Amino acid sequence: ISSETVPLILLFAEDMEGLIERIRSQFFIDYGVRLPTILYRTSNELKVDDIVLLINEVRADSFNIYFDKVCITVVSTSYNERVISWVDVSYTEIKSAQDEFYHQLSQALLNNINEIFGIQETKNMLDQFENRYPDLLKEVFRHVTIQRISEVLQRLLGENISVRNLKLIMESLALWAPREKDVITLVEHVRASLSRYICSKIAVSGEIKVVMLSGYIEDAIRKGIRQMDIEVSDEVMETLAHALRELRNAKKNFVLLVSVDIRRFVKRLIDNRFKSILVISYAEIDEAYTINVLKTI
Amino acid sequence: SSETVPLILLFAEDMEGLIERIRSQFFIDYGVRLPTILYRTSNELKVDDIVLLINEVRADSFNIYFDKVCITIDALGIPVVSTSYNERVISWVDVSYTENKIKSAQDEFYHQLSQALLNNINEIFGIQETKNMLDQFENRYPDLLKEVFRHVTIQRISEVLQRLLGENISVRNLKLIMESLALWAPREKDVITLVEHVRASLSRYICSKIAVSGEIKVVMLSGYIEDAIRKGIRQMDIEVSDEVMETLAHALRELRNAKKNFVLLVSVDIRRFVKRLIDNRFKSILVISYAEIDEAYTINVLKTI
Amino acid sequence: SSETVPLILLFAENANDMEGLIERIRSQFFIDYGVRLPTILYRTSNELKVDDIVLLINEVRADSFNIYFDKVCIVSTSYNERVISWVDVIKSAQDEFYHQLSQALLNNINEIFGIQETKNMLDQFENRYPDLLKEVFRHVTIQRISEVLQRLLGENISVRNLKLIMESLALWAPREKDVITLVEHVRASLSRYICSKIAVSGEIKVVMLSGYIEDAIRKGIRQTNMDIEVSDEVMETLAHALRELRNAKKNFVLLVSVDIRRFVKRLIDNRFKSILVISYAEIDEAYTINVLKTI
């Protein structure tokens, strides 16, 4: 007799447990979230390369990974509308098959983090945090509730930001929570204090390849804001989508650079159509980093 | 493994003695007990390349030749391998040419590292770090601590202390900072203005660190430029035109490129606003007000922007 | 050390009699002002001259002195724009050094005497006068008592008679909320002590102010806490008259109105600190008033 649904199930085709524990370990290093124990079971309906992620016994995401062969950025497959090329282990003499599966799996987990990381997961994290920083925890609890801390942490993970440096997140909250009430704008302040980390994960050889917005498109989104939620015309949406599709199909790795006030609203307009792209504001850009503009939409 | 390591110093492919000397001197010069620094080696890095990592993220890169000296001369025929930190060029001379000021290699690395730590003090010094400092201070001054806690919270005391260190002001003389807070916190309820009151009471210390042989090399501001920044205040935020910004940047660059160490003397009401206009462009120039300059100190004006 | 050394005295690189001198200075400061000074650190420097002495408050340079311990003064040196002459073996070498050092300590009394120093003083006071202490704490905070005591010391007034200071506070604190105005009331109750230190053979040498200059300072009082701001013309007229009296053997005290005495001191303190500002409410009876000049 059961009581509740099993949180994580990795469906495979008809050493494996070592991989599951390696993913659980790396996700804690990369994002600072203690993942639940993943259940492994074989299915006859699946293909030799097919891997299906199940969150609360419901299908969440499908994966195509060839464990006996390495891959580069010839067999081709796509994840988040981005094509990946797979080649044999002999032609390499580049990212490993196990490391690429983790990258695809981690993104799917962050997209459905609301089912994995919650208020109870935040409390257990804050209980351990109390042992080293109890007075910092007291100043935070004075203005924001456990639900508010859980919401801020979940919103950061949804846009690929590590909560491992909770001390810096709590320090930002303890400073801005007596000033701001809105959680969405409170997350933006936490992002500003994490500008050095944000730049580090999106920079390659010191430079950041950005795709900025034109004065017209920037002002069109600014007016689309209504009292909290964004609503823009199909003409502005098509001009933005076509430009992003032109860069994604060309296989260009980039980050969208927009204004501070519209950053949260721009993300909502692309969230469903484009998932792999990250939206960063000017306030989240740190010095000593070379800003390279690729295209102005 | 649940926590991110606070400090990592990556070196080239006795060392612990240097790390502890930095930790000791930082507490003497600023009154902040630094976390234990981790020593690591890398084949990717050069011989002189030293990179500082705050919470496993790259913070600052340094170029120090531990088998040489420093001087702020070279045209008379000396093998000089010059480098730069905070847009200020530093000349490296061999220990053989010393016998002819002179700065040590490990002392230069400390001066460069200590500046980088104060620029990222929000990740090293916080509310928990101040509470531990105030609890030790309680054994000495319990009633002084009570009068301060009557008006300002642990977060506000942490904010004041962080804002002072961010402009190279030591928190070792906490008694004077607390005495200044206990007097002004019942009157002023704004952190940025409260820090300015603590700065004015620390005028003797500020002047002592920026003066050479009882003389402060200041760079004044003209009536027009001073008035232009005054109207830049909207709410609190500062916003000025590109023309006024270029006039201030060109004159500062002219005095920075040409070997000249100075301080910027401005009005009390715009001191905090002038700092925000230059800190992102230039980080080695200190902003001082007329209330912060103590008597019996020779004021030497170099330029008026 | 976690905390900076409160007092350091650097001397010439030349006996253990120096420790006797430090303790004599510490004892006399409590007799003259009633403040228990922190233990002064004795150090020697090869950079300093045979006559040079440097005072350090919180490991920062505060004041420099020129004293000849083998001579007697009445070679020439100057302190606070006032000149003095030394001669071979009237004022003693250690007694004149104390006068110069004690003045420098009162100019930086905020870094030596604070809330905790006031609390330790009030705790000893509680053992003798507990009900008088209770009436003061009913209206005045520890910070305000510490501030009142600091304002008096900065104007060369002893806090030894804490009873009379507390008695004055208990009477005026339920009436007045301004700390600056509260100190003015303490000075009025200390009128007998003030006159006793500024008078020689029962005569007070005063330098009064003209109706015009008195009204000029009265007009310069702004509500921007209140601050004083007057024109350069009135400032130069006041400075030139004070300078003329100083470049001449003149020992005087400035006598002005009660309403402006706190603002008149502010305009002088920035330039000259040796000259004292006293109000008409502070001059005690049976004391001869000698008007030297009217600015």
PDB file of N, CA and C in Angstrom, chain B residues 218-274:
ATOM      1  N   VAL B 218      45.128  67.425  -3.435  1.00  0.00           N
ATOM      2  CA  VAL B 218      43.711  67.423  -3.814  1.00  0.00           C
ATOM      3  C   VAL B 218      43.501  67.961  -5.239  1.00  0.00           C
ATOM      4  N   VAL B 219      42.357  67.592  -5.844  1.00  0.00           N
ATOM      5  CA  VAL B 219      41.909  68.055  -7.155  1.00  0.00           C
ATOM      6  C   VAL B 219      40.485  68.580  -6.938  1.00  0.00           C
ATOM      7  N   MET B 220      40.348  69.914  -6.964  1.00  0.00           N
ATOM      8  CA  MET B 220      39.095  70.635  -6.730  1.00  0.00           C
ATOM      9  C   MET B 220      38.165  70.577  -7.949  1.00  0.00           C
ATOM     10  N   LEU B 221      36.916  71.037  -7.769  1.00  0.00           N
ATOM     11  CA  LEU B 221      35.899  71.088  -8.815  1.00  0.00           C
ATOM     12  C   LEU B 221      35.383  72.517  -8.980  1.00  0.00           C
ATOM     13  N   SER B 222      35.303  72.987 -10.239  1.00  0.00           N
ATOM     14  CA  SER B 222      34.829  74.328 -10.593  1.00  0.00           C
ATOM     15  C   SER B 222      33.346  74.489 -10.267  1.00  0.00           C
ATOM     16  N   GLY B 223      32.905  75.747 -10.059  1.00  0.00           N
ATOM     17  CA  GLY B 223      31.528  76.118  -9.726  1.00  0.00           C
ATOM     18  C   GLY B 223      30.479  75.490 -10.646  1.00  0.00           C
ATOM     19  N   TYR B 224      30.745  75.460 -11.971  1.00  0.00           N
ATOM     20  CA  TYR B 224      29.847  74.909 -12.989  1.00  0.00           C
ATOM     21  C   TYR B 224      29.677  73.386 -12.851  1.00  0.00           C
ATOM     22  N   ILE B 225      30.796  72.627 -12.812  1.00  0.00           N
ATOM     23  CA  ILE B 225      30.809  71.160 -12.701  1.00  0.00           C
ATOM     24  C   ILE B 225      30.169  70.730 -11.362  1.00  0.00           C
ATOM     25  N   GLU B 226      30.456  71.470 -10.267  1.00  0.00           N
ATOM     26  CA  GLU B 226      29.906  71.233  -8.927  1.00  0.00           C
ATOM     27  C   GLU B 226      28.382  71.436  -8.918  1.00  0.00           C
ATOM     28  N   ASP B 227      27.897  72.484  -9.616  1.00  0.00           N
ATOM     29  CA  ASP B 227      26.477  72.825  -9.724  1.00  0.00           C
ATOM     30  C   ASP B 227      25.734  71.858 -10.649  1.00  0.00           C
ATOM     31  N   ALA B 228      26.419  71.327 -11.688  1.00  0.00           N
ATOM     32  CA  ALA B 228      25.852  70.384 -12.658  1.00  0.00           C
ATOM     33  C   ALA B 228      25.522  69.035 -12.008  1.00  0.00           C
ATOM     34  N   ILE B 229      26.384  68.564 -11.082  1.00  0.00           N
ATOM     35  CA  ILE B 229      26.209  67.305 -10.347  1.00  0.00           C
ATOM     36  C   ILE B 229      25.070  67.485  -9.320  1.00  0.00           C
ATOM     37  N   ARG B 230      24.983  68.679  -8.694  1.00  0.00           N
ATOM     38  CA  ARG B 230      23.973  69.047  -7.694  1.00  0.00           C
ATOM     39  C   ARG B 230      22.540  68.877  -8.225  1.00  0.00           C
ATOM     40  N   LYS B 231      22.299  69.229  -9.501  1.00  0.00           N
ATOM     41  CA  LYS B 231      20.978  69.089 -10.121  1.00  0.00           C
ATOM     42  C   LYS B 231      20.764  67.681 -10.697  1.00  0.00           C
ATOM     43  N   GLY B 232      21.828  66.852 -10.732  1.00  0.00           N
ATOM     44  CA  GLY B 232      21.789  65.476 -11.232  1.00  0.00           C
ATOM     45  C   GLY B 232      20.973  64.553 -10.321  1.00  0.00           C
ATOM     46  N   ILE B 233      20.854  64.911  -9.021  1.00  0.00           N
ATOM     47  CA  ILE B 233      20.101  64.166  -8.004  1.00  0.00           C
ATOM     48  C   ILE B 233      18.600  64.295  -8.326  1.00  0.00           C
ATOM     49  N   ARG B 234      17.917  63.147  -8.509  1.00  0.00           N
ATOM     50  CA  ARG B 234      16.499  63.101  -8.877  1.00  0.00           C
ATOM     51  C   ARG B 234      15.600  62.763  -7.675  1.00  0.00           C
ATOM     52  N   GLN B 235      15.672  61.512  -7.166  1.00  0.00           N
ATOM     53  CA  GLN B 235      14.858  61.027  -6.046  1.00  0.00           C
ATOM     54  C   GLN B 235      15.273  61.687  -4.734  1.00  0.00           C
ATOM     55  N   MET B 236      17.368  57.577  -3.932  1.00  0.00           N
ATOM     56  CA  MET B 236      18.340  58.587  -4.343  1.00  0.00           C
ATOM     57  C   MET B 236      19.257  58.032  -5.436  1.00  0.00           C
ATOM     58  N   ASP B 237      19.319  58.730  -6.585  1.00  0.00           N
ATOM     59  CA  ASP B 237      20.139  58.341  -7.736  1.00  0.00           C
ATOM     60  C   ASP B 237      20.725  59.571  -8.440  1.00  0.00           C
ATOM     61  N   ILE B 238      21.868  59.391  -9.129  1.00  0.00           N
ATOM     62  CA  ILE B 238      22.563  60.461  -9.848  1.00  0.00           C
ATOM     63  C   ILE B 238      22.559  60.182 -11.368  1.00  0.00           C
ATOM     64  N   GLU B 239      22.188  61.207 -12.162  1.00  0.00           N
ATOM     65  CA  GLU B 239      22.137  61.162 -13.627  1.00  0.00           C
ATOM     66  C   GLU B 239      22.517  62.526 -14.213  1.00  0.00           C
ATOM     67  N   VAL B 240      23.663  62.580 -14.917  1.00  0.00           N
ATOM     68  CA  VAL B 240      24.187  63.798 -15.550  1.00  0.00           C
ATOM     69  C   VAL B 240      24.398  63.569 -17.059  1.00  0.00           C
ATOM     70  N   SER B 241      24.550  64.667 -17.829  1.00  0.00           N
ATOM     71  CA  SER B 241      24.772  64.634 -19.278  1.00  0.00           C
ATOM     72  C   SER B 241      26.169  64.094 -19.620  1.00  0.00           C
ATOM     73  N   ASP B 242      26.346  63.612 -20.866  1.00  0.00           N
ATOM     74  CA  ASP B 242      27.607  63.054 -21.369  1.00  0.00           C
ATOM     75  C   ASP B 242      28.706  64.121 -21.496  1.00  0.00           C
ATOM     76  N   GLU B 243      28.322  65.403 -21.684  1.00  0.00           N
ATOM     77  CA  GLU B 243      29.243  66.537 -21.825  1.00  0.00           C
ATOM     78  C   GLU B 243      29.977  66.826 -20.504  1.00  0.00           C
ATOM     79  N   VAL B 244      29.239  66.855 -19.371  1.00  0.00           N
ATOM     80  CA  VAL B 244      29.780  67.097 -18.023  1.00  0.00           C
ATOM     81  C   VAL B 244      30.634  65.883 -17.607  1.00  0.00           C
ATOM     82  N   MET B 245      30.173  64.662 -17.960  1.00  0.00           N
ATOM     83  CA  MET B 245      30.848  63.390 -17.684  1.00  0.00           C
ATOM     84  C   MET B 245      32.207  63.325 -18.399  1.00  0.00           C
ATOM     85  N   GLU B 246      32.266  63.773 -19.675  1.00  0.00           N
ATOM     86  CA  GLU B 246      33.485  63.791 -20.491  1.00  0.00           C
ATOM     87  C   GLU B 246      34.507  64.788 -19.928  1.00  0.00           C
ATOM     88  N   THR B 247      34.040  65.966 -19.456  1.00  0.00           N
ATOM     89  CA  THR B 247      34.879  67.020 -18.866  1.00  0.00           C
ATOM     90  C   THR B 247      35.564  66.490 -17.593  1.00  0.00           C
ATOM     91  N   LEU B 248      34.815  65.729 -16.772  1.00  0.00           N
ATOM     92  CA  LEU B 248      35.293  65.129 -15.526  1.00  0.00           C
ATOM     93  C   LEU B 248      36.219  63.934 -15.798  1.00  0.00           C
ATOM     94  N   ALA B 249      35.921  63.126 -16.838  1.00  0.00           N
ATOM     95  CA  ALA B 249      36.703  61.940 -17.200  1.00  0.00           C
ATOM     96  C   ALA B 249      38.042  62.291 -17.864  1.00  0.00           C
ATOM     97  N   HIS B 250      38.060  63.295 -18.772  1.00  0.00           N
ATOM     98  CA  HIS B 250      39.261  63.729 -19.501  1.00  0.00           C
ATOM     99  C   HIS B 250      40.317  64.321 -18.556  1.00  0.00           C
ATOM    100  N   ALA B 251      39.893  65.174 -17.602  1.00  0.00           N
ATOM    101  CA  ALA B 251      40.777  65.814 -16.625  1.00  0.00           C
ATOM    102  C   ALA B 251      41.348  64.796 -15.633  1.00  0.00           C
ATOM    103  N   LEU B 252      40.547  63.773 -15.267  1.00  0.00           N
ATOM    104  CA  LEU B 252      40.942  62.698 -14.353  1.00  0.00           C
ATOM    105  C   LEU B 252      41.961  61.771 -15.020  1.00  0.00           C
ATOM    106  N   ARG B 253      41.749  61.446 -16.316  1.00  0.00           N
ATOM    107  CA  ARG B 253      42.630  60.602 -17.133  1.00  0.00           C
ATOM    108  C   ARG B 253      43.978  61.286 -17.374  1.00  0.00           C
ATOM    109  N   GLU B 254      43.964  62.626 -17.542  1.00  0.00           N
ATOM    110  CA  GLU B 254      45.143  63.467 -17.766  1.00  0.00           C
ATOM    111  C   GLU B 254      46.057  63.481 -16.534  1.00  0.00           C
ATOM    112  N   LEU B 255      45.461  63.389 -15.329  1.00  0.00           N
ATOM    113  CA  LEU B 255      46.172  63.372 -14.049  1.00  0.00           C
ATOM    114  C   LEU B 255      46.510  61.937 -13.598  1.00  0.00           C
ATOM    115  N   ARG B 256      45.886  60.915 -14.226  1.00  0.00           N
ATOM    116  CA  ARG B 256      46.114  59.502 -13.902  1.00  0.00           C
ATOM    117  C   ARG B 256      47.211  58.904 -14.797  1.00  0.00           C
ATOM    118  N   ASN B 257      47.150  59.146 -16.134  1.00  0.00           N
ATOM    119  CA  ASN B 257      48.141  58.654 -17.105  1.00  0.00           C
ATOM    120  C   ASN B 257      49.527  59.204 -16.758  1.00  0.00           C
ATOM    121  N   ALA B 258      49.608  60.519 -16.474  1.00  0.00           N
ATOM    122  CA  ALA B 258      50.833  61.177 -16.031  1.00  0.00           C
ATOM    123  C   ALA B 258      50.972  60.926 -14.532  1.00  0.00           C
ATOM    124  N   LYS B 259      52.062  60.255 -14.120  1.00  0.00           N
ATOM    125  CA  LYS B 259      52.327  59.866 -12.730  1.00  0.00           C
ATOM    126  C   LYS B 259      51.982  60.962 -11.717  1.00  0.00           C
ATOM    127  N   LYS B 260      50.801  60.840 -11.092  1.00  0.00           N
ATOM    128  CA  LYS B 260      50.311  61.798 -10.105  1.00  0.00           C
ATOM    129  C   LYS B 260      49.229  61.184  -9.217  1.00  0.00           C
ATOM    130  N   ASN B 261      49.593  60.810  -7.977  1.00  0.00           N
ATOM    131  CA  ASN B 261      48.663  60.241  -6.998  1.00  0.00           C
ATOM    132  C   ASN B 261      47.943  61.381  -6.284  1.00  0.00           C
ATOM    133  N   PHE B 262      46.597  61.383  -6.326  1.00  0.00           N
ATOM    134  CA  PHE B 262      45.795  62.459  -5.740  1.00  0.00           C
ATOM    135  C   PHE B 262      44.483  61.967  -5.094  1.00  0.00           C
ATOM    136  N   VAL B 263      43.727  62.923  -4.524  1.00  0.00           N
ATOM    137  CA  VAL B 263      42.430  62.754  -3.872  1.00  0.00           C
ATOM    138  C   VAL B 263      41.477  63.833  -4.446  1.00  0.00           C
ATOM    139  N   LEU B 264      40.164  63.548  -4.512  1.00  0.00           N
ATOM    140  CA  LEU B 264      39.194  64.502  -5.053  1.00  0.00           C
ATOM    141  C   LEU B 264      38.414  65.192  -3.926  1.00  0.00           C
ATOM    142  N   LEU B 265      38.624  66.515  -3.762  1.00  0.00           N
ATOM    143  CA  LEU B 265      37.959  67.319  -2.735  1.00  0.00           C
ATOM    144  C   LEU B 265      36.741  68.036  -3.332  1.00  0.00           C
ATOM    145  N   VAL B 266      35.536  67.620  -2.899  1.00  0.00           N
ATOM    146  CA  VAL B 266      34.247  68.151  -3.367  1.00  0.00           C
ATOM    147  C   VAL B 266      33.373  68.603  -2.173  1.00  0.00           C
ATOM    148  N   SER B 267      32.147  69.089  -2.458  1.00  0.00           N
ATOM    149  CA  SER B 267      31.186  69.535  -1.448  1.00  0.00           C
ATOM    150  C   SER B 267      30.599  68.331  -0.697  1.00  0.00           C
ATOM    151  N   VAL B 268      30.165  68.553   0.558  1.00  0.00           N
ATOM    152  CA  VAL B 268      29.610  67.542   1.473  1.00  0.00           C
ATOM    153  C   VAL B 268      28.312  66.919   0.908  1.00  0.00           C
ATOM    154  N   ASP B 269      27.423  67.751   0.334  1.00  0.00           N
ATOM    155  CA  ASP B 269      26.124  67.338  -0.206  1.00  0.00           C
ATOM    156  C   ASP B 269      26.212  66.498  -1.497  1.00  0.00           C
ATOM    157  N   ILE B 270      27.344  66.550  -2.228  1.00  0.00           N
ATOM    158  CA  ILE B 270      27.494  65.812  -3.494  1.00  0.00           C
ATOM    159  C   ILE B 270      28.625  64.752  -3.450  1.00  0.00           C
ATOM    160  N   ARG B 271      29.363  64.644  -2.319  1.00  0.00           N
ATOM    161  CA  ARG B 271      30.487  63.713  -2.123  1.00  0.00           C
ATOM    162  C   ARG B 271      30.128  62.254  -2.475  1.00  0.00           C
ATOM    163  N   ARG B 272      28.972  61.761  -1.992  1.00  0.00           N
ATOM    164  CA  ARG B 272      28.504  60.393  -2.245  1.00  0.00           C
ATOM    165  C   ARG B 272      28.048  60.203  -3.702  1.00  0.00           C
ATOM    166  N   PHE B 273      27.547  61.278  -4.343  1.00  0.00           N
ATOM    167  CA  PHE B 273      27.053  61.255  -5.721  1.00  0.00           C
ATOM    168  C   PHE B 273      28.196  61.304  -6.737  1.00  0.00           C
ATOM    169  N   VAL B 274      29.266  62.071  -6.441  1.00  0.00           N
ATOM    170  CA  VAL B 274      30.453  62.201  -7.297  1.00  0.00           C
ATOM    171  C   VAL B 274      31.172  60.836  -7.356  1.00  0.00           C
TER     172      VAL B 274
END
